[PDB]
C-alpha cells in the first residue's frame, strides 16, 4: 500500500506517534516519506546481507528476523514479513522500540539526512487529523 501524506499522518497519530519519546508527528511522516516514499511494501537489500523492510525501512540485522541475515539480533522480536503489511501496527511497534534507544531517530538515515533540522511540522500541515 502507498499511503497519502495526510492519510499516514492520521494513521500514525492513531498509532500513538505524535510526541512519542520527544518526537513530534511530523518527524515520523517525514521519515516515512524519505525512507520508503510511503510504500508499506518497500524493501532494500543492503551490502552486509541485511534488508530494510516496510514503510519505515526496518533493518533485518538488528530489528527483525527474515532468516537470511548473518549477525541477526531480532531486537523487535518479530518476523520481517510482519513489517510488510498494509497495516502499520507492527512497523510502529518496532519503530517505537528503536527510537527508545539513546540514538533516537538517528537510526533512520533518510530521516537524519532529509528531516532532522527541517520544519518537520510542515509534513502534517494541511491535513485533517
Amino acid at each position, epitope marked *: 500500500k502507498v499511503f497519502g501524506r495526510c492519510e499516514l499522518a492520521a494513521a500514525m*497519530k*492513531r*498509532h*500513538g*506517534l*505524535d*510526541n*512519542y*519519546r*520527544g518526537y513530534s508527528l511530523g518527524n515520523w511522516v517525514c521519515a516515512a516519506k524519505f525512507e520508503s516514499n510511503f510504500n508499506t511494501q518497500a524493501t532494500n537489500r543492503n551490502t552486509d546481507g541485511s534488508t530494510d523492510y516496510g514503510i519505515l525501512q526496518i533493518n533485518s540485522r*538488528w530489528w527483525c528476523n527474515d532468516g537470511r541475515t548473518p549477525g541477526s*539480533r*531480532n*531486537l523487535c*522480536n518479530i518476523p520481517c514479513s510482519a513489517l510488510l503489511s498494509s497495516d502499520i*501496527t507492527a512497523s510502529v*511497534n518496532c519503530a*517505537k*522500540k528503536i527510537v*527508545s*534507544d*539513546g*540514538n533516537g531517530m538517528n537510526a533512520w538515515v533518510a530521516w537524519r539526512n532529509r528531516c532532522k533540522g527541517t520544519d518537520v511540522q510542515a509534513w502534517i500541515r494541511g491535513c485533517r487529523l
Partner: antibody, heavy 113, light 107 residues
Framework: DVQLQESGPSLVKPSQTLSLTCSVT????????WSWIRKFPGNRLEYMGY???????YYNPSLKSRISITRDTSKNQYYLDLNSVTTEDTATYYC???????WGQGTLVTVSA | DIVLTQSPATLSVTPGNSVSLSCRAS??????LHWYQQKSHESPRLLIK???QSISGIPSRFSGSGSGTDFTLSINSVETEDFGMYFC?????????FGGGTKLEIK
C-alpha cells in the same frame, strides 16, 4: 526460551550501595533492552530504568541519579546498583525485558540499621 | 511526569460477571498505555499492549480500549484466576510511570 532471575543480598544497611544481578538464560542479553522495576509496600510500582542495545541508559529522575544499570555479555547478566539507600528503598525488585514479556520472580530487599 | 490515575481503587465482583477498570492520564499519550496483572507473591504479567493490542498467551476475555487520556481494561466474565491487582503503565514519555492500581476481589 527465555528466563530471568534476580539474585543478591536481601538485607542491606542505610547509606550503603544496594546491588542486584539479573541472570538471563535462553538468549543473549545483546538481543534486547533490559529493565529494573520495584514495588514498594502499598502496591506502588516504580519503573527504575533500562539499558538499551547501544549501551544508553534511561534512569527515573525519582532516583536522584543514585542508580547505575550495567551489563556483562560474557556472563549474560545485567545489574542494578543503587547508592546511599535509605529505608525508603525497601521494596521488591524485579528485572524484566523492555517489552514486559519476560520478568524475574522478584526479590525483596529490606534496608534497615 | 505523566500521572496515571486508576479507579476504582478496589472492585468486588462475582465470578461470571464482567468488569471494566479505568486509567486516566494527566496528558495525552495516544495509544501508549499498557496493562499489567499482578498477584501476591508474583511478578507483573503483561495483558494488553498499546491500549488495545492482544498478547499471545493471555485469555481472550481481557480487552483494552481508549486513546488520548482515557483508557479501560475490560474483563468479559471474570474467572477466579483473575482476582489480583491490575496496573496501567505508560511508555509515551520517560520516565515510564504506573497507575496506583485497582484491586479486583471476589464478592
Amino acid at each position: 526460551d527465555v528466563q530471568l532471575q534476580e539474585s543478591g543480598p536481601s538485607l542491606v544497611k542505610p547509606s550503603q550501595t544496594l546491588s542486584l544481578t539479573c541472570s538471563v538464560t535462553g538468549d543473549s542479553i545483546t538481543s534486547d533492552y533490559w529493565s529494573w522495576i520495584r514495588k514498594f509496600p502499598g502496591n506502588r510500582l516504580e519503573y527504575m530504568g533500562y539499558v538499551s542495545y547501544s549501551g544508553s541508559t534511561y534512569y527515573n529522575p525519582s532516583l536522584k541519579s543514585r542508580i547505575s544499570i550495567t551489563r556483562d555479555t560474557s556472563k549474560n547478566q545485567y545489574y542494578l546498583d543503587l547508592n546511599s539507600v535509605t529505608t525508603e528503598d525497601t521494596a521488591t525488585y524485579y528485572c524484566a525485558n523492555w517489552d514486559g514479556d519476560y520478568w524475574g520472580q522478584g526479590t525483596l530487599v529490606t534496608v534497615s540499621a | 511526569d505523566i500521572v496515571l490515575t486508576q479507579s476504582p481503587a478496589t472492585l468486588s465482583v462475582t465470578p461470571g460477571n464482567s468488569v471494566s477498570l479505568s486509567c486516566r492520564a494527566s496528558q495525552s499519550i495516544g495509544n501508549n498505555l499498557h496493562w499489567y496483572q499482578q498477584k501476591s507473591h508474583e511478578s507483573p504479567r503483561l495483558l494488553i499492549k498499546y491500549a488495545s493490542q492482544s498478547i499471545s498467551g493471555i485469555p481472550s476475555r481481557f480487552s483494552g480500549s481508549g486513546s488520548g487520556t482515557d483508557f479501560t481494561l475490560s474483563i468479559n466474565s471474570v474467572e477466579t484466576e483473575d482476582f489480583g491487582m491490575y496496573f496501567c503503565q505508560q511508555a509515551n514519555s520517560w520516565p515510564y510511570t504506573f497507575g496506583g492500581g485497582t484491586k479486583l476481589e471476589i464478592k
